[PDB]
């Protein structure tokens, strides 16, 4: 039976799903861990105990408990990122799309969703794996992991709330794929992990973490890298935020045990309602409960691991979007609105700079301002708007990724870098937001192939070449088919630093992605902030 | 009669000189101070005592004692700035060119030479006042002042070597003009002082100093301003350099009196031979003996005077050249040569910014480097060279002047700002040096009007335009003649300036505003913080 699969934890029964006038098999909502509920809240995950009978894997699972965005009620542009299933702490499930007929031993791709480590679901429409699995003949897995305080409350020293347990959730799903994907026609020796934003940082963190390295072959990182300023905190700061969470909930704070015991008695929504109150500053692109540099999942500082070559040496493919910052300014900074051009006054520019670089002293804010201000034309609201957009995306996404790219390439086995800069013809968000954080995902997952969604024919072709780059890289470590007639995406090298644009035009090769601003963010500003 | 003038100090006899197929009167080498020689070395100047008989004013005077540039022997481009008369400590003289026939009561312009406060002569070819006096019908005076240690050795608290005596030489010549120019056909109520480089800084210093302000009407500043980083030192640093000069010469250092007595025994060239040894850093565009912020000539810090409005409120006309830095790199920085395009390696670029900003810490040098480096093309030797050129000129001339112009305009009565960016067609220096520090002077003084010097016809028209702007401003406080395109007032809000070149005038705003925010606001804050 094509839909009946016996795994090491028991039998599962999938469902036959239509795709683009054909069909493939889907195994939805397979458990990979014990429910992390009750006295297991904040604890490392435990493997799912084997079950008798047949697991009905015909429907999507629950989503993990998380903040729900109600900024634009009814608006598809925001609501499509919210949970579309019931939320529950019982949420550690994965989904598998398998070509039909079942392949013998084919390439596997495992998707890790983003969402700032505080939101995200495996079940969103834009993460539907059926188009990529069918078009490129890959076995596509999407995992899940605890987000927010449930996944990343860190009281270092405690074994009840150690921190990083959402990362351990991801690892346990990777271990399940390693142990079971052969029963679905996948090769556990050819697993590519890919993810976007926090999922892209996560992918980088598994490259670094010794306990993860042997559970995958190579990696794709989209608009995120492990060294991003929002993607981790120190053990001291994670302790600070966890204690502040208890303080917001009238918890006994005398010891880790009773603080944890207090927090385990609260309903999930009680923690979520105060989650944002524990941040140290008014800020944008900052999130309360994130991975912690603990000495276990990460043996030393990320920078020292990067400098020494202490990471998995393989092939990577990674990149960024042109306007990573716009969504964060819309939600968090003065003068921005989705129903206007959002021309930014000089006063609102100054406010946004402080929100964008909250850890900076006054000298550091001056440096950022001078670097991004045209003093011949300082009251230009369009230049002010775009300058802030660039500040947010450069500081938080692009320049951290370029730092990772350059350190990794010194030891890795092949780097391919992209710059996604296509604005979708059917975008529901205003034109000033440009090429938004997250809006390459629908191209990676082949949604433009669905004629009902009203993408252009050029956008379908773009989606198809991106899916084929991604999958060919997954299968071989090279996005290019050698001996093909197509334009070749060149290796990124330390010396020449090449990358391509991804858009609907013929390929352009460039060098030194945003090198000028990234010298500022990666070398000058940190030296300034460390001055005294 | 026309050439025989009785002044308050005695009779002077000038000479009839040819100018452009005509003639005017020249009175050369008139003394305005007692010779500051012997025990008067380093002291404030004293008025020249009256003489009987007729002072022969037919010949240029001696030049003050100074370092002589021998980098390019026989090269006219460097030797034209060196002394062209015998050097002597007996050098406090001035020169006057008077239209013929003698006007009744006309506008006076007084030239103050530059040269880093360590060199300069009133007698150079490019300062010949006859073309400007004749063409614009003004009385043209050039003064002189002691340079180097002789003018600016500063041992504050001593009255024997107090500092700033070179500035007091300038003021005494202005006092002499105030008292006597009426006998030469000049109006002492309509005196414009103007100078370039250190002379431009000097002009600004006389605007600030209460003891100078009543001795002139208006001012012109060319490629220099009083707040320039090279233009003054603190009394502590001045004292340190004076003590180090004595140390270099095996002087007794126990007391001011003993040090000064030692330094007064040395021959002039003995002091000049060690002058540069007292600088605290390897550097370019830094000079050993310069004005001191003493509490007397300058009542408080320059910045506080500028902020409070404690200065002379009048009209000013001022500006800069496109490539102020190139001359200093040629003489002082690795990789530059007069005989090549001087493409600058990355290594020599780093050495250059260190020499250019000697007071900066490592973080400050990084900031300057980031501000001027194209990291898409960092091994471009042309971009590295031009970046270093901009650094030197922006830091040392352009941005200090813009800080001055913005502060002055808040209280003053009229500001006119120019940007001189014409490369002379007969320039003797290589192309990479561009529009060099000092090379607007020949246009201000009308040398393009001289056929044998082989300027183009367009360059003669430019010089005539510049001479008329300068003199009309001197006469009225406004460079424009009330009838025709206008040079607009620089205002705090609109910040307009004009280019000066052979092309029709264009108005711009915010001269090098991006780099001057860096030099005037961010870098000072960075260095004060780190
Ligand atoms: C600043 O401090 C505080 C902050 C808050 C509240 N902040 C906020 O909600 C910011 C926010 C976060 N998301 C997450 C929604 N999904 C996503 C995306 C998810 C994953 C990956 C890419 C995504 N790309 C999106 C692009 C657009 Cl265009 C819209 C939504 C996107 N939506 N908005 C409350 C209180 C505070 O004190
Ligand atoms: C910090 O200490 C140091 C500082 C420096 C940096 N100062 C120096 O270059 C000064 C200098 C002066 N002359 C001889 C002066 N004639 C002049 C000028 C005179 C007055 C006004 C403008 C002049 N425009 C000239 C242009 C050219 Cl092209 C050639 C000579 C010019 N030659 N050099 C170098 C080394 C150091 O150690
Ligand atoms: C599995 O669940 C699906 C979805 O409701 C249902 O249609 C199907 O009958 C179930 N299979 C069983 C009960 O064997
Ligand atoms: C990857 O490693 C193999 C094995 O040593 C080597 O032959 C190849 O050159 C490497 N490729 C890159 C791009 O480093
Ligand atoms: C897609 O375009 C069709 C044809 O114009 C239109 O009827 C439909 O409403 C569009 N669908 C969406 C989801 O925009
Ligand atoms: C003034 O000096 C010049 C040369 O030094 C001389 O020719 C002239 O006759 C002198 N005038 C006198 C001595 O009256
Ligand atoms: C100069 O001062 C006069 C007299 O007070 C005044 O009328 C005029 O506005 C001033 N001009 C400028 C440019 O400030
Ligand atoms: C000026 O031009 C004349 C005439 O062509 C020429 O003889 C002379 O050499 C030139 N002078 C200089 C100083 O170049
Ligand atoms: Cl479909
Ligand atoms: Cl390489
Ligand atoms: Cl002549
Ligand atoms: Cl040039
Ligand atoms: Cl004004």
Residue numbers in the entry:
A (entry chain B): 4 to 535
B (entry chain A): 4 to 487, 490 to 535
What do the authors of the reporting publication say about this deposited model?
Diagnostic testing and symptomatic treatment of myasthenia gravis are based on restoration of cholinergic transmission at the neuromuscular junction by means of peripherally-acting inhibitors of acetylcholinesterase (AChE), the enzyme responsible for the hydrolysis of the neurotransmitter acetylcholine at the synapse. Inhibition of acetylcholine breakdown renders the neurotransmitter more available for nicotinic AChR stimulation, which alleviates muscle weakness by improving neuromuscular transmission. In this study, we explored two different approaches to accessing more polar derivatives of tacrine, 6-chlorotacrine, and huprine Y, which may serve as new peripherally-acting AChEIs of potential value for treatment of myasthenia gravis. Furthermore, the three-dimensional structures of complexes of several of these compounds with Torpedo californica AChE (TcAChE) were also solved, in order to shed light on their mechanism of action.
In the crystal structure of TcAChE complexed with the 6-chlorotacrine-based triazole derivative 16, the 6-chlorotacrine moiety binds as previously observed, with the conjugated system π-stacked to Trp84, and the Cl atom fitting into the hydrophobic groove comprising Phe330, Tyr334, Trp432, Met437, and Ile439. Along the linker, the triazole ring is engaged in two perpendicular π-stacking interactions with Tyr334 and Phe300, and in H-bonds with Tyr121 and Asp72. From this point onwards, the observed conformations of the phenolic moiety of 16 differ in the two TcAChE monomers of the asymmetric unit. In monomer A, the phenolic moiety makes a π-stacking interaction with Trp279 in the PAS. In monomer B, the ether oxygen of the phenolic moiety H-bonds to the main carbonyl of Arg289. In general, these structural changes lead to decreased AChE and BChE inhibitory activities relative to the parent compounds, with the exception of the triazole-containing compound 16, which is a more potent AChE and BChE inhibitor than the parent 6-chlorotacrine, likely as a result of multi-site binding within the active-site gorge of the enzyme, as confirmed by the crystal structure of its complex with TcAChE. In this context, the huprine and triazole derivatives 6, 10 and 16 are those with the most potent and selective hAChE inhibitory activity, with IC50 values of 59.2 nM, 200 nM and 7.18 nM, respectively, and selectivities for hAChE over hBChE inhibition of 55, 16, and 40, respectively. Most important, these compounds are 23-, 7- and 192-fold more potent and 37-, 11- and 27-fold more selective hAChE inhibitors than pyridostigmine, the most widely used drug for treatment of myasthenia gravis and other myasthenic syndromes.
